[PDB]
């Protein structure tokens, strides 16, 4: 362990995500993303069972809408 | 372990994702992504069973809509 | 282990993804992605069984719509 690491002894589920990025825009007189009409609808309506022993590390959907940098 | 690593002793599920990126735009008088009309609909409505012992590391959909850099 | 690596002792499922990218746009007076009308519909409505012991590392669909760099 030096920056974060699951270390279980029976079951280790994870969603390790180490997205180290760098973005260096420049230049002038430039439009980026004039109009955006977005309709994200991540409407989780799941269901479980009489013994469903889920062990999810991340139980959800990632919905992104960008113009330059989408690190997902 | 030095930057994050599942190390279970029975079962180790994971979604390791180490997307280290670099983006260097430049130039001038330039449009990027004028109009966007997006309709993401990641509507999870799953179902489980009477003994479904799921062990997902990441139970979700990634929906992206970018113009330059999509690191998924 | 130095940057993240499943090391189970019975079962190790994974979705290792190390997409290290570099993008260097340039030039001027240039359009990139004028109009986009996207309709992502990753509508997971699966189903499980009376003993379905799933062990997925990443149970989801990646839906991207970019113009320059799609590292999936």
Numbering used by the authors:
A (entry chain C), B (entry chain B), C (entry chain A): 82 to 153
From the study:
Approximately 2–6% of ALS cases are caused by mutations in the antioxidant enzyme Cu, Zn-superoxide dismutase (SOD1). In contrast, wild-type-like mutants, such as A4V, D90A, G93A, D101G, and D101N, retain most of their physiological activities similar to those of wild-type SOD1. Here, we report the cryo-EM−determined atomic structures of homogeneous amyloid fibrils assembled in vitro from apo, reduced forms of the ALS-causing SOD1 mutants G93A and D101N. The AFM images, cryo-EM micrographs, and two-dimensional (2D) class average images using RELION3.1 revealed that both G93A and D101N self-assembled amyloid fibrils made of a single protofilament with a left-handed helical twist.
We unambiguously constructed a structural model of G93A fibrils comprising a C-terminal segment (residues 82–153) at 3.09 Å and of D101N fibrils comprising a C-terminal segment (residues 95–153) at 2.92 Å. 3D maps of the G93A fibril and the D101N fibril revealed a single protofilament intertwined into a left-handed helix, with fibril core widths of ~8.1 nm and ~6.3 nm and helical pitches of 240.6 nm and 65.8 nm, respectively. The subunits within the G93A protofilament and the D101N protofilament stacked along the fibril axis with helical rises of 4.88 Å and 4.82 Å and twists of −0.73° and −2.63°, respectively. The G93A fibril core features a very compact and serpentine fold containing four β-strands stabilized by two hydrophobic cavities, whereas the D101N fibril core features a less compact fold and displays a totally different serpentine fold containing four β-strands stabilized by a hydrophobic cavity. The hydrophobic side chains of Ile104, Leu106, Ile113, Leu117, Val119, Ala123, Leu144, Ala145, Val148, Ile149, Ile151, and Ala152 are located in the interior of the G93A fibril to form a stable hydrophobic core. The hydrophobic side chains of Leu84, Val87, Ala89, Ala93, Ala95, Val97, and Ile99 are located in the interior of the G93A fibril to form the second hydrophobic cavity. In sharp contrast, the hydrophilic side chains of Asp96, Ser98, Glu100, Asn139, Arg143, and Gln153 are located in the interior of the G93A fibril and form a hydrophilic cavity. Importantly, Asp96 and Arg143 form a salt bridge with a distance of 2.7 Å to stabilize the G93A fibril core, whereas Asp132 and Arg143 form a salt bridge with a distance of 2.9 Å to stabilize the D101N fibril core. Two pairs of amino acids (Asn139 and Arg143 and Gln153 and Arg143) form two hydrogen bonds to stabilize the G93A fibril core, whereas three pairs of amino acids (Asn101 and Lys136, Cys111 and Gln153, and Asn139 and Ser105) form four hydrogen bonds to stabilize the D101N fibril core.
